[PDB]
Symmetry: D2
Subunit: 315 residues, 4 copies
């Protein structure tokens, strides 16, 4: 039967707080039918798998288990989460190189298993590791996807939502560029129920320019704030990963801000970087090129340039 | 216990295709815990209630029954789908029951009957809500979504004004994932201006086309009513295009007309005044004028 | 990419109140990504498709359209709903024969399209037409499924639920046999949260035997009551069909009372009849054989015997 | 408006792995509209609240914040996960706030601390609920589901008694789609009695195994707490195994212990007394005895 294929299988690589929280999100939302969890720390993955299985009688059924790279053979999705952290005083290039070795030891056995689905990359630095996964795997550009600025965009939406007291699902505003210190807000096309932020501020002049600038700064620094407060961030990114997973596995043609391959968009080439894109069961369909102001376009060029320099030195 | 209040009750007035379909939507999506169905045809409402109850083992539980206006005493929401003298015969007994929630009006002509429900009921402006152009807006979004092959949930565009022949599209603020339609056409010039014109004309005539094909429209509006119901009952502060009372917005006063608004458990919280182009503003003024005259 | 298959497609044959309501249930619950609606009345199917599409912006996306049998080529599921109604004074055998001709004109072009999924049969008489679909299609027994007594079982559960004031999801009780006048309740294994009905009645002696007997009678006659009141029944069966569809398309291994092929169970052979079964993406896995009391087993034998006689005369 | 009440508020006490995970579950499933998180470690609760808020654009909206006991004034539900003197320092200020909803107790030893919360709070018996053997029951169901390759939602089996080493399986009423385990083994004799014994022993030791492997258990109980929370807030009259007050059931009095019960917006509505075999009843008596003595 053609309906022998109606079994969606996800292989998760990295079972830190991000990977674990992602698996839990997929369990609670009933997304996919099978999750294999791969990590060097085997005991932890078994522990997580059996803790997660106990949730199953209150949600939809799944097979969940501690897995190996060879289990990716018939997977739909390989989700790569756990980047080696930057050490005090280590360069960005050194961070990249140590992650490339590790990432090679994940991607090569996954490819060798016969895996032929979509790579979803969340490991930091995400735009760089998305590109690296593309280079290592040999896959088509549109089947290697990074989480990019999807989380920063959610943070930005929720911050605006709180300021104006509106459901963030009615707020539409992007953060773009390389996820990290060089990302920028796209204020020119940001809106609340279709009303641009510029228009909203005209109607509500108590909202000062200084507060909007600070709101974006606070978004850019949000991970640092959360890490300072509780040690690590995870609920945001796990949720954003589950959302991306659903867009793929339910073939949605949803627009999400993701790390996608530049082929001329924004005057950029041959890097992965954060922009809105349409995603479906076959990966990235269209890349949306928001017409940026001169100030926004310069931010995009600066973000990309430093990123491209690091990629060039790295490969 | 304060938790004795965690029981949400809807009274539906009118059990035609629209009302029936709305009840089904509420059942399937697990919205509210109690639905009473009020209509002159008592046998039908009983038939519907018991057919609907049969869906409940595959969803979350509810109390569903054939109801009378007096059952609105402790309802959260009265949804009117059942037409001017008829409305007075519904609203007066609902008010007389002690009902003290939110009126959601879907009966046609909706903007007029929303106003009329406000006048008859004596309720505050923000607690009498009409479905307005929420359905035309969904039609418009889905039509754009099909043209560009994108989830409609990523298309943002409004139809505004009076629901009916004088409604208009707000192209100036319409977008797909934040990229305005004018910007999208520049990037995708196979999309001709004439197709966009036609798209809106097809949205405006869509009820007529559906009626011609199968006799009546109901899945669209049922679904829009359920969505509005969820925004209220889950206190969302969602932005939806609804029939709301004009107190200066767009230069208008003392009518209910379609515009985006924030809605929550207490009804309308903010009315969004989209800055319209001169052409869009004239369309709004003309739609409102003719409506106000009636 | 293997994730080119993550697009679930349902072809609905019959766009009466049952088929239409089913399509609406699938839209609201976000089940499957594509519904093609096939009916002799083409205008009605176009009308329904476009009315349904207007719901899409408040739920998950789908392709919905007026379809033809050839569109079943790559479908997961073909759902057959609209049986020709029994006319006053027409025999049951005549009802069967006129439905067989029509059903042949559906099943042969579906098979000829290359369809290779699962047939879900809801058209009345359902157990007979499930068997007939099996005979006509050539498919394996476990990929031709009828709705059977899933709806009667829901009616029974909800009636008990109302009597005792408990969520019907906590009530577990079956109606079995041929869906229709010969079906019977399985009181011996019926329970509320694990407490059998016999045990519940001991604890709550206000519940009289006469009331339980009447409750089952009222379930058996429920369609007649609904038809007398509003002309037709549809919300019950549409919901039960969507539930079965979800069990298949999400590979649940759920237990549902369905019309399934007897290979010795209950002392029966070579008929489709209603019993609990496990269903998943490949159709019927296990058939559950509830150990019936002598009275319940005799009801099952009588239901099956008359059914088998009609099938024999018909083929 | 009566609809001003359509806003459900939870106060969570204890923001360790269990409490954090529960908040995440409530967020993802769209249960309640407001979560305040109370813990001695204020920086952590703020860190969690803002990490959680970042999930809200992909789900339904909520207010989520670092909270204090005084915020329980108008809560629907107080969920205690944070341990005997500690409990008095939580319950007294919650009661003093004016809180008047339902206590859901998950802290270990749960049956004891549920009783203690009842004693300290002065609340009615049916409005102090413990998670009891809801998690052990889920473990048991999933373990059977895996053995037979059936959705656990179609497996019905209970663990009862005090949550902990004296709990026991109710094999006499356990079933898979209505077919008792004794009946299933007759049809499937590759399933040995020894495997069933082991299965229960593995359920009883499961927390220990999980702790050994990853240090702490949390997804199971979080999920069970969210399910109980939904049963209350959506007024379900669902049957769940919970810690409930014994008033004669199973020959027991004046303790909280695990048994199936009906729960709705007002808390416990009926306690189900499963007719146990002599062996199962003795297990219940022994579990209760030792508990009562403590």
């Amino acid at each position: 039967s053609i309906t022998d294929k109606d079994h969606q299988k996800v292989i998760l690589v990295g079972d830190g707080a991000v990977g674990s929280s992602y698996a839990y999100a997929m369990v609670l939302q009933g997304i996919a039918q099978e999750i294999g969890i791969v990590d060097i720390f085997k005991d932890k993955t078994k522990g997580d798998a059996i803790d997660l299985e106990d949730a199953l009688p209150f949600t939809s059924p799944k097979k969940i288990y501690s897995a190996e790279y060879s289990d990716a053979k018939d997977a739909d999705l390989v989700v790569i989460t756990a980047g080696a952290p930057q050490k005090p005083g280590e360069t960005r290039l050194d961070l990249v190189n140590k992650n490339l070795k590790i990432l090679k030891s994940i991607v090569d056995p996954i490819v060798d298993s016969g895996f032929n689905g979509i790579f979803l990359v969340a490991a930091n630095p995400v735009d760089i590791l998305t590109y690296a996964t593309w280079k290592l795997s040999g896959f088509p550009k549109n089947r290697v996807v990074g989480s990019g600025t999807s989380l920063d965009t959610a943070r930005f939406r929720q911050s605006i939502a709180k300021m104006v007291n509106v459901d963030a699902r009615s707020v539409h505003a992007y953060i773009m560029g390389e996820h990290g210190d060089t990302e920028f807000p796209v204020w020119s096309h940001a809106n609340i129920g279709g009303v641009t932020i510029a228009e909203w501020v005209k109607a509500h002049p108590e909202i000062k320019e200084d507060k909007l600038v600070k709101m974006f700064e606070d978004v850019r620094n949000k991970a640092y704030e959360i890490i300072k407060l509780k040690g690590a961030t995870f609920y945001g990114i796990a949720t954003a990963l589950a959302r991306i997973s659903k867009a793929i596995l339910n073939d949605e043609n949803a627009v999400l801000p993701l790390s996608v391959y530049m082929d001329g968009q924004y005057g950029l080439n041959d890097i992965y970087i954060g922009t809105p894109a349409v995603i479906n069961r076959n990966g990235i369909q269209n890349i949306l090129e928001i017409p940026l102001t001169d100030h926004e376009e310069e931010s995009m060029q600066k973000s990309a340039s430093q990123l491209k320099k690091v990629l060039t030195d790295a490969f």
